[PDB]
Amino acid sequence: KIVNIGAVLSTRKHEQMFREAVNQANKRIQLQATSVTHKPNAIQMALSVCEDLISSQVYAILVSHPHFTPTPVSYTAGFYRIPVLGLTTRMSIYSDKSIHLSFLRTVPPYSHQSSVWFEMMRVYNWNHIILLVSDDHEGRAAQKRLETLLEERESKSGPKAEKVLQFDPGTKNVTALLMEARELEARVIILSASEDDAATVYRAAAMLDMTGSGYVWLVGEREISGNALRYAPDGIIGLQLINGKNESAHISDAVGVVAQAVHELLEKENITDPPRGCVGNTNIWKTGPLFKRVLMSSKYADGVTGRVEFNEDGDRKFAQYSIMNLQNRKLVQVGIYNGTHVIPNDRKIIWPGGETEKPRGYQMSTRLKI
Amino acid sequence: PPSIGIAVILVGTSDEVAIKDAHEKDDFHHLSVVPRVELVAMNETDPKSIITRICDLMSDRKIQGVVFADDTDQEAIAQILDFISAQTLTPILGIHGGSSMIMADKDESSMFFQFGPSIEQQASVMLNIMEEYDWYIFSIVTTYFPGYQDFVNKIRSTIENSFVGWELEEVLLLDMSLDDGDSKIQNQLKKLQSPIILLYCTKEEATYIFEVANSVGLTGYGYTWIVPSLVAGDTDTVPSEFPTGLISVSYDEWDYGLPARVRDGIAIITTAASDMLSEHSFIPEPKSSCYNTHEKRIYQSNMLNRYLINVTFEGRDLSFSEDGYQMHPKLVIILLNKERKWERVGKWKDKSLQMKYYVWPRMEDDHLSIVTLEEAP
Amino acid sequence: TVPQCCYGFCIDLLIKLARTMQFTYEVHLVADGKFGTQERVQNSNKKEWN
């Protein structure tokens, strides 16, 4: 009758208040409490989940994000094929269905996030747009999503696509791609980069003077926010995923969906509790079919971030992403989308070029080659 | 010859005097390194326990290389095993069973290799089996398991690239995730038409899969369905629900011995050590505590893999696929017998292959022998 | 790869073509010989026009 779940993160306050979440949770036969920290060494930390969580036989293990390294539990629960509770990962490589069979997090893919930018097409009303990206696997699949929305509109029938960029990490001179942008008349380009990659973009643009007024560098805060803001050209096109903040809100409705599922969970037939002993036991918990099935069946009424649900990917659904831009080289919130509903903010969103307006830059070039 | 720790992880019952004897038997005098053989044993399949063994690797001494074999049916064991080794970023080779089984989702830095090539090469050999079966019309049926779009992908690569009209009906995609209450997989069985079709899933997957096949009974005489080694799972494990006499291919269980190939993989680590200190002018620095190894990782050189690329020993080529598979593995075709025992169906030697009979067993209409003399027009 | 000369009744149709819609006429050659075809590479399995 004891409903037990695990947790892994750094914050001890989030651990205690997390136990409080268990307290209000058992009410909202009673639940049991289990938690762990997030250790630096994935080896012995994986060992920690091994000893504790197996002996705990938890329903799920809450996980925040203190490249691919920070998913040892991804290896762990799979040994039991156990239900996985993530929080702070906006990276969809962790959401790749291959490696992780059942892994559930609270946060949408930063890649799947840029679908927000796909709507920002409808915002800027810019049909012709370009794909700027660094070369990497996660980025590759990200662009794959970009196309997913792209041709998604095609069948949905003018979301004009363009060439795509691939820049290996630590690219010395992107002038191949960077300078190659000059070949594009329309100034709309969707940028995809990591931190220092985005740095190479920032120092790259005006170096070639491709920053010229109207040239649209469009990406997310995941690219834009942080040290990128240092050399970032002001008023650059960007937005931030809304509501992602800190271990508090993540940990808040987490057990919310957890127990909200635990209700109909025990309602199943031939049910079995989470398997306990790891030693000598190679058989994963068969309840995982119904457990993760319920995670799929899980659509939450009201979470800490609002109505909580997810698609077949099982992270979030119709999430909000805050629009923002640098106001006189100072990031200022430009708005948000509901999931689909772009909220224009109070102030006018400035263009680093002429005034605030969104120009039409696709005007043809005189040179005509054949 | 620099002493290199050779750690043989023996899962379950094995002959240690035989393998260790081969370690004493085989010694490469043309080698610039020396083996230090180690026989490791873990009686349990616990992934956590596997991790603890990884702790035992350096916990014993400085670990040069990791040789583990698998007698069990758990592939993901080998998977997250290679994940652990990835955290270790050290040489490791699966020697048998799941350890030899094809590892999906190769990690970025993962060096883990094993005897036998990828399912990529496998399915190709299957097409060759069609050349044996001489049935030009076929199809494919599979669940959502990994390599799906890959298997169907290179499958299509074989399809459209041919100068012959060999027919491919369709490719049946499935999954285990959707609620079986719909039983629409049985409708996919109703969708099954063509005399030949490809079948891709696990053996554990083959539980519900082939179980439903019995439900449709669509496998009756004339129905051609074949799957690969790991698809079929273990050599000595025969479930009743498996398709009768079903054709399959594998790396050689009968011909190639696991303790026999143990000395081979040892020699693989050796050939790895062949050019190592020569060209790199350095020796492998083992991580004292892999969990605490986060410091020394700055000086890491991946040329060991670059060294590990091209390799050959004992007339055998120890070079491996850049995808991690075997550069030129040897193949073994097999199919169940009337005794419900998989019987060797042949061997694919590179592209080439050798069938065990001038015709398929073939186990209503019969033949129409259609003997004729060619007279044009 | 060297500068060469361009004349043709087709090319002429380009001439009158721009003579309709003004654009700076630039003339290139064909690297390979063919026109173009969707083509399967030896890897990545993607049909590619050429």
What does the H/E/C string look like for B122-159?
HHHHHHHHHHHHCCCCEEEEECCCCCHHHHHHHHHHHH
For residue B61, CA distances in Å to A47, B7, B34, B109, B285 come to 20, 10, 16, 23, 12
Cβ neighbours of C23 in A, within 8 Å: 364, 366-368
CA B34 to mean position of chain CA atoms: 29
> Given 3-state DSSP classes, what are the helix, strand and coil percentages for chain B, each rounded to the nearest 5?
35, 20, 45
Find the residue in C nearest to B154 (Cα): C45
Return the partners of chain C (3 or more C-beta pairs < 8 Å): A, B
- Burial class of residue B238 in the structure, from the number of CB atoms within 10 Å of its CB (0-12 exposed, 13-18 middle, 19+ buried): middle
Cβ neighbours of C40 in B, within 8 Å: 157, 160-161
**CB distance from C9 to chain A under 8 Å?**
no
Cβ neighbours of B146 in A, within 8 Å: 98
Q: String of b and e for A151-173 (b: at least 16 CB within 10 Å)?
A: eeeeeeeebebbebbbbeeebee
For residue A36, CA distances in Å to A16, A85, A170, A174, A185 come to 11, 13, 36, 44, 54
3-state secondary structure of B368: coil
Task: Confirm if B144 and B177 have CB atoms less than 8 A apart.
Answer: yes
Task: Confirm if A247 and A65 have CB atoms less than 8 A apart.
Answer: no
B105 dihedral zone (left: phi>0; alpha: psi -120 to 50; beta): left
Technique that determined the structure: cryo-EM
Asked if the Cβ–Cβ distance from C26 to A364 is below 8 Å, we say: no
How many pairs of residues across B and C have Cβ atoms under 8 Å apart? 7
Task: Confirm if B95 and B318 have CB atoms less than 8 A apart.
Answer: no
B279 marked ligand binding residue: no
3-state secondary structure of A149: helix
| Dist CA A140 CA A306 (whole Å) | 31
| Dist CA B218 CA B222 (whole Å) | 10
Asked if the Cβ–Cβ distance from C45 to B161 is below 8 Å, we say: no
3-state secondary structure of B330: strand
A355: tokens are 């005034």
What Rg do the C-alpha atoms of chain C give, in angstroms? Answer: 16
Phi, psi of C31 (to 5 degrees): -55, -70
Adjacent-strand bridge partners of A86: A63
How many pairs of residues across A and B have Cβ atoms under 8 Å apart? 68
Phi, psi of A302 (to 5 degrees): -135, 120
- Burial class of residue B294 in the structure, from the number of CB atoms within 10 Å of its CB (0-12 exposed, 13-18 middle, 19+ buried): middle
| Dist CA B152 CA C18 (whole Å) | 48
Which H helix or E strand runs over B82? Answer: helix B75-88
Q: Which long-range contacts (CB under 8 A, 24 or more apart) does A300-304 make?
A: A300/A253, A300/A256, A300/A257, A300/A260, A301/A260, A302/A253, A303/A252, A303/A253, A303/A256, A303/A257, A304/A249, A304/A252, A304/A253, A304/A256
Cβ neighbours of B47 in A, within 8 Å: 50, 75-76, 79, 278
Resolution number, Å: 5.0
Nearest to A137 by CA among A176, A96, A101: A96
Interfacial B residues in 26-55 facing A (CB < 8 Å): 44-49, 51-52, 54-55
Q: Which residue has the tokens 């560098």?
A: A217
B96 marked ligand binding residue: yes
Taking residue A265's Cβ as centre, other Cβ atoms within 10 Å add up to: 22
3-state secondary structure of A222: helix
Asked if the Cβ–Cβ distance from A366 to C27 is below 8 Å, we say: no
| Dist CA B301 CA B288 (whole Å) | 17
3-state secondary structure of A309: coil
Asked if the Cβ–Cβ distance from B161 to C40 is below 8 Å, we say: yes
CA distance B157 to chain C (A): 7
A125 dihedral zone (left: phi>0; alpha: psi -120 to 50; beta): left
Residue type, B226: I
Asked if the Cβ–Cβ distance from B154 to C45 is below 8 Å, we say: yes
Task: Confirm if B210 and B243 have CB atoms less than 8 A apart.
Answer: yes
Cβ neighbours of A185 in C, within 8 Å: none
- Burial class of residue A5 in the structure, from the number of CB atoms within 10 Å of its CB (0-12 exposed, 13-18 middle, 19+ buried): buried
Task: Confirm if B334 and B121 have CB atoms less than 8 A apart.
Answer: no
Task: Confirm if B250 and B258 have CB atoms less than 8 A apart.
Answer: no
**CB distance from C25 to chain A under 8 Å?**
yes
Beta strand segments in A49-146, E: 61-63, 84-86, 130-133
**CB distance from C45 to chain B under 8 Å?**
yes
Non-local CB neighbours of B152 within 8 Å, separated by 6+ positions: B140, B142, B171, B173
Asked if the Cβ–Cβ distance from A370 to C18 is below 8 Å, we say: no
Give me the half-sphere count of Cα atoms (radius 13 Å) on the Cβ side of residue A291: 27
Asked if the Cβ–Cβ distance from A43 to B44 is below 8 Å, we say: no
Asked if the Cβ–Cβ distance from B294 to A41 is below 8 Å, we say: yes
Task: Confirm if A116 and A239 have CB atoms less than 8 A apart.
Answer: yes
Strand pairing category for A36-37 and A3-9: parallel
Phi, psi of B41 (to 5 degrees): -140, 135
Nearest to B48 by CA among A135, A118, A345, A77: A77
| Dist CA A179 CA A176 (whole Å) | 6
